[PDB]
Amino acid sequence: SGGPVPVFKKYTTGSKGIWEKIRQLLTLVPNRSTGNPLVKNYRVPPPGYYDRDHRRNYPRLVAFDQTKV
Amino acid sequence: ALRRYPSGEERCIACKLCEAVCPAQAITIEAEERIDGSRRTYKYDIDMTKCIYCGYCQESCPVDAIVETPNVEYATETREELLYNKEKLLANGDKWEQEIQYALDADAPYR
Amino acid sequence: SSSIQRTLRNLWKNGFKKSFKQLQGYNDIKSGRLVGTDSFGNKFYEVDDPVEIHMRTRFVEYTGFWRQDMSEVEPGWHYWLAYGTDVPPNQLKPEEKSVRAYPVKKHVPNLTYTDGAYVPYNTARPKCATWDPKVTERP
Amino acid sequence: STKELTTARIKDISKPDENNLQQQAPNRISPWSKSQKPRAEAQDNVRFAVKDLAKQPRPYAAIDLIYKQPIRYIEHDNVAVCDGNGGAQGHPKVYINLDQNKAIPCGYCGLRFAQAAFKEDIES
Amino acid sequence: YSSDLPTDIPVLSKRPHTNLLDYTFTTFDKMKNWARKSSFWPMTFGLACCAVEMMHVSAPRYDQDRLGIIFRASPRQSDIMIVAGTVTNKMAPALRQVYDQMPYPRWVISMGSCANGGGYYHYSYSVVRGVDRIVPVDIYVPGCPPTSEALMYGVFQLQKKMMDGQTHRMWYRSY
Amino acid sequence: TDLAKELVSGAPKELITERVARIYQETETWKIDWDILNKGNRWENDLMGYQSSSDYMQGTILKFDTREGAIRFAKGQGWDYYIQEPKV
Amino acid sequence: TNPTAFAQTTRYVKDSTEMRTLVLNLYRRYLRHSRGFVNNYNLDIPASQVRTKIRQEFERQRFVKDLPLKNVLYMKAQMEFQELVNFWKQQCHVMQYFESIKGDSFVQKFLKGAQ
Amino acid sequence: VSTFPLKSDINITKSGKTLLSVGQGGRSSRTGFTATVFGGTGFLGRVVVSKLAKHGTNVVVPFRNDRARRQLKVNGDLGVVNFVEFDIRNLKSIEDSVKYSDIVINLIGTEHFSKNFSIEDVNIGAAERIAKAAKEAGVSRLIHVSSYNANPSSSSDFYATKGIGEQVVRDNFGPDATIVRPAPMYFRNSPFLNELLQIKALGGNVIFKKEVYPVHALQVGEAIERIAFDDATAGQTYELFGKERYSKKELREMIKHIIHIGYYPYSAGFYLPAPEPFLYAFALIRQYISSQPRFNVDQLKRSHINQEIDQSAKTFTDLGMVPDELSEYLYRYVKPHIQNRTVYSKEDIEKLRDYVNTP
């Protein structure tokens, strides 16, 4: 369930020191992050036959006209 | 970019798999028997103004001869400079070889 | 990350000369550990500040003063500046490097707007060969 | 000298020069294919009038960097296996029968092989 | 009549400054070109998928505005025209009307494959095969679509050309 | 067959008169293609050796099903044509 | 939904005589707008010239015979009227519309390349 | 133009080169020539260059203005239009534009001397260097453009230098060179018409009493095109002019009447009677104070001299082309500057011309 979540549970840049308490007094919603990703975790290490055949058994094409109906 | 073996011989053996897959028909290959007899190509042109940077270049090669470098800053004043003949492709292949080593050796497991 | 506290620290460490170079092209006085230079001459730095944002932890300082061209960056380092690898090109183990049988001369940037610009041409001879004039007289 | 520059040859009678901008490649003068257009002819075009020939792309010729490489040898066997000599980023594996008595190149790399006995005969 | 033209006098782009006037009219050219180099106001001529990248340059990650780039909708207020996307035949007459209304000086940037030489739709019955058949182009950005940095690189190269303008020295020396 | 449908297809005037279409059979169906132009079908571009062309019907082939169906089409469009009988 | 100016329903006319009268009114409609086509598109040719070209257009294809192909020719000519009167075609297309256009002996065609 | 300009697919030049044209004459076709059009960035060049490129002839256009050569590349295909930076004082740059050229066209010609060139230095000094340098490179054909009133002994600087330009070429390029004399051409942004449309034309009575034989610039543009592909037209002199004779003052009121320009002509400055010394003095003063090419002292004399047809030369019909009259094209070229538009057709120009002559 997506209820409200604190700032320190979101992988984002936070506030260190008394500025955290300054932020929690001025900001309207204290549990929103600045949105800048965590440089220390986010992208830290860079990226550096018949038994199994069905196409030949596709459903056939049969048309029903007034004669066969 | 056109790659090259460490021994120096060209990786490309002129399938024309290149000319067939290319959705925009930007690959032009003409080949014949070399003097040593080993099958190589004397014409290999890419119309970078016609290419869509699809990536079927790199996927089609059975010898990894044609690959797409991580470069994007090669804008040119005259459009004629955007028609890459074989020598221009081979120049990039040498010029970007170490970088292509980063790309392939970091994408080897997933292919 | 943008306040004057970071700028003043980076101003004092770098000295006036390097910073004024950053105040001419970079527009942001930054400092970092030098990680080496390429063949062309660009100096590749990495920042150890805990305040820089995610994508700004690796930068360069070009050789030129007034004009900077991105293509001057050597291809080996060009992948490092793009955050695709944690191993700088001068720290590669020899089992991974590129070994070529041909000389590797100095890096050359993109050569547009200059007479050194690349010119395409057709590498194939014309497919029809004309006949050489030859005459032998009536016997 | 207007003769070998526009003719295809196995090798070059003269010793090539890296600083000659009329050669097909820095390491070879004559072109290595009958249909390949000689570089001296191509540069004699309208668009090379003011363009500098020094900066044009002149990659080293392939047909030389291979022949510098010494021929590989096989001891006490007549089947040569070559798969690019680079691991799994090479050409498809091919087996080379060594029954014929000369240097038989690989399908893709161009590497040449031999046997133990014919090592003295082939080198002649 | 009497005439004697020398032969070793070089071309304008190679001619060094000799007297004090050659420094005066170089100052006017740099000062005037620096104004156009910085106040680089293209025109929002996004046509196709290439237009997404042209927006991402204005995005906060790249922020074209930091370089003095402010897109202007009207041709009169725009000194550049970034032709991004396919130029169909149904558009080509309209494109010429938009280009011809730009007051001089004017530059055109061709971004992407479609604007350069036809691109994917080169063999289409209703696609102009390269916008260079309609408007002169000063720089071609290759890609599909060119990355947001590739366009910035293309912008920078054109800027490096504008800083090389020598109009007011041309009057003094070549006219 | 009697209908002058060429005034509704929008094809250029040259298709009615100056072009010839072959109705052949490559092994169960028939095809239609236009014979090549006298000159200007393929000239070597002097820049990059591209196979230039002015014929706009070179890349066109129509896959039919039955012979009389193809002949019906050719008469419907007012196309000059000839039929190549395959060897048995 | 509201259809645009100078629109007509697409109807498969099943009379030979009615189609004759529909065309005749249509030809007058082009001539009535002769002055406008000059002023709208800024054509270099005067009003009498356009009527002359319009007449050359209408005289050209008056001998068609197939009624099923009569409606098609009347349908598309209606679109040409609707596109032109609503000022939809660009200026260049109309200028080139009237700017289009004797052969040569076999020696003349043999030498240069014929076709 | 039509569909293909060349008379025959294979043409042999005077130098032995065997050129084979390919294609059906489109943008992607070729003709195997290489026509260096000197002064191509000018008014006349942009027509000469345009026709040559669209039919597949490589054009090498030496320029001195960098921002004016950009628009010439639209006409040709990739590689068809080439550029060489040059100045007439740089001999080496001249030889860059003639090395691969089979056709060399000369269009350089000025009416106002500047702080770097005199009238002789351009109509002769440029022409002499261009012609002589072209010969040394084995150029098969040279085509030249001079004044319509070339005269070695004329007191007008323009006519005197242009005439000597004919002699000095033929002593440098040789018998192969050709000379073409165009009458004042009228086209979009034509210098011949731009003086008539200007509202503040001081000395309008004096300047516009001169007589001319106006010729359509497109035909002269094709006139060089017809000559270019033919070797039969070497060593000739061609004067190209229009059948119906017109005078500037006849045109100026004819031009103004189409634009409908009561009190306004008397006030805005249409008719500025000024003393002859003042006109001579004003032109001299601006010659040291102006920065853009203004009305010159030479055009004060030329206004007293009427156009002269030379009978030793050859007309349009010598090339198989019938010249077109200013009546059929004068309206459209001033249509930019003009309830219900009145289109002054070909015949109705006379009826306008009638209204001007009636007092």
Ligand SMILES: NC(=O)C1=CN([C@@H]2O[C@H](COP(=O)(O)OP(=O)(O)OC[C@H]3O[C@@H](n4cnc5c(N)ncnc54)[C@H](OP(=O)(O)O)[C@@H]3O)[C@@H](O)[C@H]2O)C=CC1
């Ligand atoms: N209807 C007409 O225009 C008339 C035609 N003529 C003559 O026909 C010839 C064609 O000229 P036209 O195009 O009509 O008018 P322009 O004066 O515009 O043509 C001038 C061309 O020659 C170049 N030029 C002039 N001086 C120099 C110089 N010192 N160095 C290099 N280039 C120079 C110009 O270069 P750039 O423009 O790039 O600076 C331009 O390309 C002229 O000689 C003209 O006098 C006769 C009477 C009137």
Ligand SMILES: CCCCCCCCCCCC(=O)OC[C@H](COP(=O)(O)OCC[N+](C)(C)C)OC(=O)CCCCCCCCCCC
């Ligand atoms: C009163 C009017 C309003 C104000 C006028 C000023 C507006 C801004 C001017 C922009 C200038 C510009 O752009 O100069 C910067 C450009 C950019 O270098 P580049 O183009 O790559 O060439 C330079 C490299 N070269 C020449 C080797 C190719 O040149 C210069 O480095 C000029 C040289 C530096 C001049 C420093 C000394 C003069 C100081 C004058 C101030 C006191």
Ligand code: SF4
């Ligand atoms: S990357 Fe470009 S050239 Fe290569 S196959 Fe794809 S579209 Fe063709």
Ligand code: SF4
């Ligand atoms: S797939 Fe590889 S080897 Fe085959 S033609 Fe293309 S580049 Fe050459």
Ligand code: SF4
């Ligand atoms: S070049 Fe590619 S991205 Fe750009 S408009 Fe064309 S298809 Fe879209």
Ligand SMILES: [Zn+2]
């Ligand atoms: Zn192998």
